[PDB]
Symmetry: D2
Subunit: 494 residues, 4 copies
């Protein structure tokens, strides 16, 4: 029972954002934006392509020039702007929470309580680091005085998905701006609206023109323009592994720009006999079914000891049947829609393979409703390692429960995947928890919990689930360029 | 592989060490050094007093002068000397292990396998840090370029006890020399010999004269001279809390020199129901009975759940009766003597109080042998909080086993002490281990183990068990002085 | 031309602050507070003694209990309260700036532009660190999992002077509270008012009761109670070296509490031939004459090359004669009064010694006015090393200008002092600047500037000018206690 | 006058190195290795291709398995092996110095004094970090205990050039092995011999089989196999920018392996009026002409103030004419040959363009000798920005001297390049040095020096001169994978 927007929501910002002003698309074309729940068109946004990006890049490069406000400005002041921006987002919390819920098909409660809270907390965390990005002074051999500067890199192209459009945005700009970089953000073609509102707040907060630029458009057009641009120093991507390979490839052909990928995963869970079953069942459920299972950190594969396998499956099903599919703005709705028809069809396709390959359908396993892209909360059991649903990322409300007996084997089964974004370990024994977590090849390992991401902790992936960390102290290292200054002196003294 | 010294050991270095040369005592007086096992006199060492210290200090200050070899020398090279010294100690491992065992009354096996191994590992660890003590460059407000230098402090007075004369020495000089400090070491009046041999190796390794100086003597004479000296920048102490208060007091009256104390403790152990009893019993036993219980980290108070109290007491006693008291140079002797008659009498005094105050004597509880200061391995049970043996540090082979029922209470009972050097937690549950360890007010908390100190981990104490950390990354911070250099510039750029 | 307080200032908070509520003095006695300019009594504040401290300590200890709001509260939230407090101070900026100016005898412009700005910036800096105080995970030898927690120490007694009552307060509480400590602050007997107003803002900001406690009183009474208290874990002092020695001494006799001193200095300046004389003259002037030269970082001794000695003296005098002594609230007044009659008499005493010992009085050199403790801006030249004015800290508007010829000599002359809080180097040559700054034994060395302190840079002193750093990353290390948790595991893997 | 090898050098190790044993090429084919000075064939080495790499990778992966010696082994012990290896290289210093000089066409004195010294120093530096690669413990929001492990990545493919075959090798394996990675090294097709000898020392030092593997072969064959291999986690490259783009591209198509590039540069020098001309001339000369100008950090473009332009050119020429081209093993020879005919022709081609495009040839400008690939030390003056010799990397003994007048302009001219590996600033003014160095877009900036690389300082490049740092504290961050372990607890306490 949360406060809803008193007025009716009325979209305003639907244009390209360069030098803290609203540009039209160079082509003049505009793409539509729909509510995934109602399939209704909300508005049309300016369709950005290369020409638009080239403008944004030249604005960002100009803003990054030596002697510009952004470079000369105090580190403390950069954080002050980030902290003001957080306050502006907190002010327009109902507006954004509503807009995110409509556009992203995201439960309003989650949108208000998780996403908007996450944006504020993270921005404020990032504000803190601004004037705490310190270099080093090295006691080098010889009569020399050596010191390093953790400078900003420069123009950073930043590509975000549709699953958490706001949170994902702050994860990009927050660290980047804190370190003193200028950014060219390309939001998803599905979910540009939320980001564009923030662009207005960035102007209002008083960020120098060109520091933040936002170019809404399609992936192959605008996104490719960023990945291959010759004056972009870094690219930051979050999306399918398929595209991540094109981003890194296009970065190689262009100007060897720096790369941070945050790709999807088939994140496994291991539930040993000695485990709080309710804890494990609830967190594993939340892990895989959060935001219609449209999380990179989805608890896809859930390995369970034989002794407690049947009991786990029993509880996981009854929990999954207590969902009410409908409009995310509607109070009482506990599950929302998929983003678009592409995911909808993909998820249903993998659900069919689960049946065809002969996994036991415990519940769900089909679409819901005439209107909207709604998928029933599905649960598969007796799943094998060589099934499509136990290999490919689903990115929908589908849970796979699998049994094990040997601890050594299940760890190797869990690690047997090109992905490795996260994992979950559920046990009371310390030795087990520490050793298992050390063995698992995951970027973030949760013990007796799941999906616990915060601003302070660094979040990334092993193998083909990422190419860098995004948060915490270590996340800031990848938005800086380390210059080494070695000065000759007459005599050195320790 | 326990090789014993083929030849009979013959002492050589028994003199004051200043400017890498052997001085006599200014007074001319000499104190004796006995074997605690046989009570035989080994030799007489030069008795250092203030005049001797004043010489050592002026040598150290000279060696620390701006432009001296030690200051100009590369950071890498300081580590190279430390690493060479470790190799020299490894060469003379049998010589030192034998000498330590004779002088310190220390089991030869432990002396060879623990102490000598510890000296080498630590020196080599400290060598590594030499050229990795880096400062910072601050992104300060205004048009300024700020940077910090983690310089050495200067002349560091270093006072060591008798329990681990070698290991304690390396813990002082290793970090100190790595950071580029000069040291004036005062070894214990009981155990100077081991340290003096190392002094020869420090010369052989090619340390500049004056960098390391060693002044063997008595505590109130030489030790007080160090604590109150007007040209000593830092003092590093390890001994009784009684004296620690005099060191800090004398530092206040003199020149506000920096202080790091490493005092004794009444370190408790908490053994919950869900614990590997054999693991707990063995580590708790080792904790309290290691080196005749002459460790600062002795498991004095051992709290046990009611359910497993009697069983724990049963196993702790049978383990304690399997000791063979005798000469520590005999390899199948499993327990050695106390250092001197002072400790011997003190330990017996506290054992009497245990009986008088009405604690149950399970085994031991009396002296052993005609010759040597040997105390029987004693075990008390049904011990209360307001007993002398449950409050005062014994520093002898005496174990106190106590029962609890409430987890919240025993934690407060454990913390209810002015000491707080270490603690021990024995449980299988993670939540318990983490929470209990967080609650306990101890410098080092061991989970399902005890007495596990290494070079990499920082070791110190809460409350009146210490005033600083000595090892690891953090231990080096206390042998450095941070200079801040702020340079005015025309224009700043991030 | 600054905004002045529209209303007339009316004091309100004049009582002891414990558990976020206003207590009376246990004795019932009250000490007066005067305006140093007019010698008028402003009000009377409750006089705190031991009984009052013992209350405050028990409130702080209660607030630091395991499970209390302050301990359980998120690190991010501790910073949020600190950031709110900064906003509250920014709101009541005119109120505090006026109150500080009246009570402290501080130029309103400086009070508003420097002090109040400094309080906000520092609090906001300290807010940032709250959730960025990270421990370590050590790759220790053996099958163990080691990690460290940078916990808060606990109850921290904090003693502040009268020169910058607000700024000095924030330098204490800011880092302390950020790390999660509870504080018992004792403000100066001269300048309690400013601190007490902030106490109201600390309540308003919503800090848990007992976290911050303020006990105004006299030094030997309340201050001694803190220094020797048996339940205070740390003491933080800033004042005379005389008392610093009593603080450390009383800490030794009590409970070996941790100590950070920030004492006075005889901070020297070295001005080489190749220097922007106007830059050097202006900064050296500002250095020694800021806030009536009542700074710990006062440019007492100013060494100048022979070639430019006479020219420097000439310009330093004409600058010093352009001061208008009067009420600091009066517009146009460029210099204010000394804090009390004690300093007034001390400063005049040292001015007499300058004449008696035969230093050339260039200007000033006497008192001013019938009312108020005003000293004329004095300048001495042809000053020698063995003069009282070239040794003892004056803490008044008196400048000593001295000549040199050898660079090596003047460095040794500069270092020839028990003090070493700061220094100043004025040259165009890099080699010179770096080498000289490396040679000087000062906590903060300014190059072609002076008195440039910020929140980001760590500020302390060498030798008898301090016992720790207060700001920056390193300043926070001294408000934390490092717990080491070593967990036994079955098998370790890198 | 250095000690030369007493015996005649006789090659032994000329085979593929997998699991610490000598394999033949799967194909059976062998490529020759020539002395660039004499053009004589030294020997034939086994020609590695994919099949050989696939073997090496599977050996490395096996050695990296959880529970293997390399993973379980103590961090301290990994450094001990690295330190032993350094000692073995120091023992075989004359052997390697001679072999490097013969194979690499490298001045014996430089080979012995620089390269072999560099290998030892760096290995020993890297040994130090082994047990000092610490993670963090985050004070995360919520009741959780978060900690990070800086684990090794895994199998690291490492590709080295021919210019400094030994030093470049240690820069790869040293950090990699210290962090606990297994490596598959591919040495240059020109210079495999030196690396293979070290492989014998790696066995002798007692590194577990499979930890280090070396596969000599051609770039497009073996190198491409590494860059596109599906079980290689990281690739580390050092060579032409041309190939760097293929490495990153092949990494995108394969398994999104991590990438660190260390490409060439057109590193500029800026010499202001106020500069020690002899210092500038000597360092700028050394910078561009070191090892026949076959350094990535070559001082290609040398900008000089108008006032001192002619004088600089005058001194730079007379210095360049004092070179004696011949066999690098011959005493008195001051310049050696280029590596192969490819570089030889390329360098001569660019020298022709210098004449054709109308740059003033001051000296040299043509080949030397009938035998060997010797190029005359060439100097161009009156060089413009749009010349081939002022844009393309030459990688030969050719110096370009250019004039400026505006400081602002020359900085933009210096930064106007896709390269940015290093730079050089020569001035006495501090403000100038700091500001200019801050403005320049170079990975390493030298002030009043050039080519001063050490193990402690991190070395890399901006823009298209690199994709990471290789040395110092920061260099180790790129041979680690950060796992985040978040544990749910009942109650959190700070
Ligand atoms: N760095 C500085 O601020 C310098 C201090 N002074 C001032 O000169 C006066 C000399 O009187 P002192 O009693 O020496 O003051 P002090 O030097 O200790 O003054 C600093 C503050 O410490 C506290 N304090 C004073 N005496 C104390 C004691 N015995 N134990 C614990 N805390 C104590 C009081 O709150 C006082 O305002 C003070 O007003 C002092 O502030 C003189 C020279 C330099």
């Amino acid at each position: 029972d949360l406060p809803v927007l008193l007025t009716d929501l009325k979209i305003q910002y639907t244009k390209i954002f360069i030098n803290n002003e609203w540009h039209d698309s160079v082509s003049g074309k505009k793409f539509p934006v729909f509510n995934p729940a109602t399939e209704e068109e909300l508005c049309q946004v300016e369709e950005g392509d290369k020409e638009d990006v080239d403008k944004a890049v030249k604005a960002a490069r100009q803003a990054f020039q030596i002697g510009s406000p952004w470079r000369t400005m105090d580190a403390s002041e950069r954080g002050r702007l980030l902290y003001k921006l957080a306050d502006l987002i907190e002010r327009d919390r109902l507006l954004l929470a509503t807009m995110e819920s409509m556009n992203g098909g995201k439960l309003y409660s989650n949108a208000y309580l998780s996403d908007l809270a996450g944006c504020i907390k993270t921005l404020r965390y990032c504000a803190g680091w601004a004037d705490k990005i310190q270099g080093r002074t090295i006691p080098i051999d010889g009569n020399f005085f050596t010191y390093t500067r953790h400078e900003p890199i420069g123009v950073c192209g930043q590509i975000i998905p549709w699953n958490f459009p706001l949170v994902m945005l702050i994860w990009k700009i927050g660290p980047a701006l804190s370190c003193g970089n200028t950014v060219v953000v390309k939001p998803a073609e599905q979910t540009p609206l939320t980001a564009l509102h923030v662009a207005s707040l960035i102007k209002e907060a008083g960020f120098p023109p060109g520091v933040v630029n936002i170019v809404p458009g399609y992936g192959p057009t605008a996104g490719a323009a960023i990945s291959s641009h010759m004056d972009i120093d870094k690219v930051a991507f979050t999306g399918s592994t398929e595209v991540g390979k094109l981003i890194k490839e296009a970065a190689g052909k262009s100007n060897l720009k720096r790369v941070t990928l945050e790709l999807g995963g088939k994140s496994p869970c291991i539930v040993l006999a000695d485990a709080d079953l309710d804890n494990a069942v609830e967190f594993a459920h939340h892990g895989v079914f959060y935001h219609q299972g449209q999380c990179c950190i989805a608890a896809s594969r859930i390995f369970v000891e034989e002794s407690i396998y049947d009991e786990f499956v029993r509880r996981s099903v009854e929990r999954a049947k207590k969902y009410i599919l409908g409009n995310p703005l509607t109070p009482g709705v506990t599950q929302g829609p998929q983003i678009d028809k592409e995911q909808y069809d993909k998820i249903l396709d993998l659900i069919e393979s689960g049946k065809k390959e002969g996994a036991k359908l415990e519940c769900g396993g089909g679409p819901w409703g005439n209107k909207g892209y709604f998928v029933q909360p599905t649960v598969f059991s007796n799943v094998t390692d060589e099934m499509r649903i136990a290999k490919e990322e689903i990115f929908g409300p589908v849970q796979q429960i699998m049994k094990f007996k040997s601890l050594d084997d299940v760890i190797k089964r869990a690690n047997n995947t090109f992905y490795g974004l996260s994992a979950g370990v559920f046990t009371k024994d310390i030795d087990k928890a520490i050793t298992i977590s050390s063995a698992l090849q995951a970027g973030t390992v949760w013990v007796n919990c799941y999906g616990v991401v915060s601003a302070q902790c660094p979040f990334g992936g092993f193998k083909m689930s990422g190419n860098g960390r995004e948060l915490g102290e270590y996340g800031f290292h990848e938005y800086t360029e380390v210059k080494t200054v070695t000065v000759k002196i007459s005599q050195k003294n320790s």
